[PDB]
Each structure stands twice: as C-alpha cells, then as structure tokens.
C-alpha cells in the first residue's frame, strides 16, 4: 500500500462507522449466496437471512478490518492471531478471501457511492488483498 492507498482506505472505511456490523453481515450474506462453496466453513452457523450469528460474526469481521486500517503499515502484527486462526487452525482456502473481498467491495459500493471512485476502488482492492495475504500466511 502506498500512502495514497492508505489515505484512500482510511477515508472510505472511516465512512463505515457504526454500520460495521450491518455491512460486515451483508458482505458475508453476499458471499454465502453468490458463492455457496464458502458455506463449508460455517456448518456450525445458522446462515439463514437475518441470522443473529451472521450479524455477530459480521461485526467481528468488520471491526477486525477497522483495526487493520488503524495499523495499515504493520498489518502482520495487527492480524497475527487471526492469521493463526485462518491459516493454521481453520485452513481457509485463499480463493475464499478473494470471494469475501469482492463481496466487501460490493457492499461498500452499494452503501457509499460517492466514496467508491475508481481510485478508491483500486486502493480498497489492494487493502483487502493485503489483509488476505496476511490471513493466509
């Protein structure tokens, strides 16, 4: 991430605020519906619409991204326990980080049109791919 990418991500993700749980849950729902293969990571969840488990998990995913934005120059440290969880314990397929990242971009585009310019789209894509690299390492 360049300084320009970091500036773009902080501005755009700053707009999320108290919507973190709602947007995170929406991104998860987009992923589960669009790419049903990703559901094999959540057999222990109720994944139906309006699920409280998806809502609570969506807030964790979004809050983790907020912390990553706050520590964008040292994301390996900021995501280290979650890297152990995803890469070592759960063994999440790297393809699925691409799918969730796409669904996060779709959610942000649908809720923050003015912020989702082509340049900010590119910066957010790079940010999420960087997060994904840490979580798969």
């Amino acid at each position: 991430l360049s300084p320009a990418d970091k500036t773009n991500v902080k501005a755009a993700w700053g707009k999320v605020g108290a919507h973190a749980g709602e947007y995170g849950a929406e991104a998860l729902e987009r992923m589960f519906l669009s790419f049903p293969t990703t559901k094999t990571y959540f057999p222990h969840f109720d994944l139906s619409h309006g699920s409280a488990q998806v809502k609570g998990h969506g807030k964790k995913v979004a809050d983790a991204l907020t912390n990553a934005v706050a520590h964008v120059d040292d994301m390996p440290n900021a995501l280290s326990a979650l890297s152990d969880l995803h890469a070592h314990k759960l063994r999440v397929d790297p393809v699925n980080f691409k799918l969730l990242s796409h669904c996060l971009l779709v959610t942000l585009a649908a809720h923050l049109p003015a912020e989702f310019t082509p340049a900010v789209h590119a910066s957010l894509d790079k940010f999420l791919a960087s997060v994904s690299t840490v979580l798969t390492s």
Binding site: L33, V106, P113, A119
Partner: protein
C-alpha cells in the same frame, strides 16, 4: 448454467434499467485501473496513465459499450451462452491470448459497477443471480481453452 425464475426475475428487473451507453465503459475502465496488467491488451487505446485518464478515455467508453452489448446478448440467450460467445471465445483465446481469469475479474467489476449505481436495490440475492450470469459468460468465453 440454469437460472431459476427467482434469479431470472432479479436479472431482468435490473437490466432494463442499466444505462447501456455508460455502464460498460465504467466496468472496463475500472478493470484497467484496478488490475493494471489488463492494460497490456489495450495499448491502442491511448492514455491510460491515471484513473481519470482511463475513465475519460473515449476508446474505453466506446469499447465498453461493445462489451456490455455482448453481456446483453448473453442475457437474451442464457440457455446457449456457449454458442452465443463462440466467436468471441476464438478471438480472446486463440487471437488475443487473454488469460480466462481476467474474464472472471471483469464480470466481478461489472457486478461492482451495478452495485455502485443501484445501491440498496442491488441486494445480496440480486447479486447472487448476476454472479451466476457473469460466471456463465466467463466460462463461455473460455470455451476455446477447454
């Protein structure tokens, strides 16, 4: 490969509202900005050196109109996407040597553009229907590799 009536309703309800003069250029432009290696295929299009240069580039807009028209043609022939895209598959695969991963990427950029334009109307179920479509288009365009 097969859309249910719910998925077909999702796609058709939205597609009539799509600005066919603009959305293709927006998707192609964002592809070139977000995935800059794709610019290798469009050297003849001129200035692609910045996001504003790409998005304002008349050849990007004009070509995007053709790309979207091919997507529209696929939407009119969902049960024969392979035959709808056979000539384009020969062009992209045998002639231009575009790796088919990029077909997936452009389909997903188009989905982002639809979300950006339509907001809350582009619900998770509507997106899921469009993902089946763009995956079907990508697979059809890749057929000459298969």
């Amino acid at each position: 490969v097969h859309l249910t009536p719910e998925e077909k309703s999702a796609v058709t309800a939205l597609w009539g509202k799509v600005n066919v003069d603009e959305v293709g250029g927006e998707a192609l432009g964002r592809l070139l900005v977000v995935y800059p290696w794709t610019q290798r295929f469009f050297e003849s299009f001129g200035d692609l050196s910045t996001p504003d240069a790409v998005m304002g580039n008349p050849k990007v807009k004009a070509h995007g109109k053709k790309v979207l028209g091919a997507f529209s043609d696929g939407l009119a022939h969902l049960d024969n996407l392979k035959g709808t895209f056979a000539t384009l598959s020969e062009l992209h695969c045998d002639k231009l040597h575009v790796d088919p991963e990029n077909f997936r990427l452009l389909g997903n950029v188009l989905v982002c553009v639809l979300a950006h334009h339509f907001g809350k109307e582009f619900t998770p179920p509507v997106q899921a229907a469009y993902q089946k479509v763009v995956a079907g288009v990508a697979n059809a365009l890749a057929h000459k590799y298969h």
